[PDB]
Amino acid sequence: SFVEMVDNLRGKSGQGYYVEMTVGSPPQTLNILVDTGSSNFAVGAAPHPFLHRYYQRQLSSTYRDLRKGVYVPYTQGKWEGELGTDLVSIPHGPNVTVRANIAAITESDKFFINGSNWEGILGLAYAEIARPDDSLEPFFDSLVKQTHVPNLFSLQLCGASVGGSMIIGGIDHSLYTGSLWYTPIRREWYYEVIIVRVEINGQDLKMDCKEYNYDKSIVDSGTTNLRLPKKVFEAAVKSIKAASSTEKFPDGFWLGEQLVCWQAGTTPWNIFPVISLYLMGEVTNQSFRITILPQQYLRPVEDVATSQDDCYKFAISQSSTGTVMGAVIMEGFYVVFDRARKRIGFAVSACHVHDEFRTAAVEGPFVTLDMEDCGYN
Numbered sequence: 001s002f003v004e005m006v007d008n009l010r011g012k013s014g015q016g017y018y019v020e021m022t023v024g025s026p027p028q029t030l031n032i033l034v035d036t037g038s039s040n041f042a043v044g045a046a047p048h049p050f051l052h053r054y055y056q057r058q059l060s061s062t063y064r065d066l067r068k069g070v071y072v073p074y075t076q077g078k079w080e081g082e083l084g085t086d087l088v089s090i091p092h093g094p095n096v097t098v099r100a101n102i103a104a105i106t107e108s109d110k111f112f113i114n115g116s117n118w119e120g121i122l123g124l125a126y127a128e129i130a131r132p133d134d135s136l137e138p139f140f141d142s143l144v145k146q147t148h149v150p151n152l153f154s155l156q157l158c159g160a161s162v163g164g165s166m167i168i169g170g171i172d173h174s175l176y177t178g179s180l181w182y183t184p185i186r187r188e189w190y191y192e193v194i195i196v197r198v199e200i201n202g203q204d205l206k207m208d209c210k211e212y213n214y215d216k217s218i219v220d221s222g223t224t225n226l227r228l229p230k231k232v233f234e235a236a237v238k239s240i241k242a243a244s245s246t247e248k249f250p251d252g253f254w255l256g257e258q259l260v261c262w263q264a265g266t267t268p269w270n271i272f273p274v275i276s277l278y279l280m281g282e283v284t285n286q287s288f289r290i291t292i293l294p295q296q297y298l299r300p301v302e303d304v305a306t307s308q309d310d311c312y313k314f315a316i317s318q319s320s321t322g323t324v325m326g327a328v329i330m331e332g333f334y335v336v337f338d339r340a341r342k343r344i345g346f347a348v349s350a351c352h353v354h355d356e357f358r359t360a361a362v363e364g365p366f367v368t369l370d371m372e373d374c375g376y377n
């Protein structure tokens, strides 16, 4: 019955992927950003310049006040609000209704985005990182406990306005090609994984693989960029610069501060390399790789001029909180968050970006010794 959930995600380019939900009785419709990088379900519940609608607790007969405050600081953006519960449904999801914890956002700082068309956030990660503490049951945990929905979901993010699918409770085989390759969920807090090798245009970065996961590596649909620890970021940028030295870019471009433009249809995709991330596999000494095309880490933007030039932003950036496999990574793939079996699957997405001669890939098996040494402690 998954066909009803295909194409249930929308968004504007670079503004966040959202799914439609209803909260309260009678149902109040809101668009909710899907975020595997956090664990709180929160909705705007008071006027805001960027909000065109919000949750009105007074109009819901099933609203229950929890008489407790809450605040969530993200890497970018934060909000505070009032905790409570209410009935929640997903129109283009399973035909169920669950009583879920809801953070009623009353105040926020650089969280909501003008024109994004979403009014809340669905944190799909685990209770361990929920605010104020791990006793606040996340939405998906409530869903699984109260209904017969199986304990897994899958995400197909289709980049550029944007679209995709969140298959709640299963895998839709029509959404991917080839085989699914699985990596263990190292620990149930973020969707933490272990990267065991990195190659750029087939050239090994030859770093101690712990550097790739310092201090963690997560799969995060709530972040655009591939974010890399300082040491890995510098090595990656050095290698990407060398492959594209044919042309010149301001240094601010490599910091994500400036755009680069080319005459429409003349973007030199061939001079930008592919990046392969090797992930720990399911059997001893076995890994697999996912390969990223430059079309994924060079995001198209709006030409600030009155021209038809193709302009792009560099979407690999430095991190101090470990690797973040954001939308830049996820958009190429069908990603299965198999919570029941504590693993994450990757397969080539049916809505992958096309290069004229190269293709994003998920390939295995590979042999990799001592993969456990790559996890940081």
Ligand SMILES: CC(C)c1cccc(CNC[C@@H](O)[C@@H]2C[C@H](C)CCCCCN([C@H](C)c3ccccc3)C(=O)c3cc(cc(-c4ncco4)c3)C(=O)N2)c1
Pocket: 014, 015, 016, 017, 033, 035, 037, 038, 039, 072, 073, 074, 075, 076, 077, 111, 113, 121, 129, 130, 220, 221, 222, 223, 224, 225, 317, 327
């Ligand atoms: C709450 C706890 C558990 C926690 C604390 C710190 C970090 C984390 C890890 N996950 C963070 C996410 O939850 C967290 C979720 C976020 C508020 C959702 C709403 C805004 C989305 C913004 N957006 C756009 C609109 C977008 C577009 C398409 C898809 C996705 C996003 C980004 O691209 C973006 C998001 C975050 C950080 C950066 C960033 N670029 C460099 C440094 O920062 C960029 C962020 O912070 N996104 C969790």
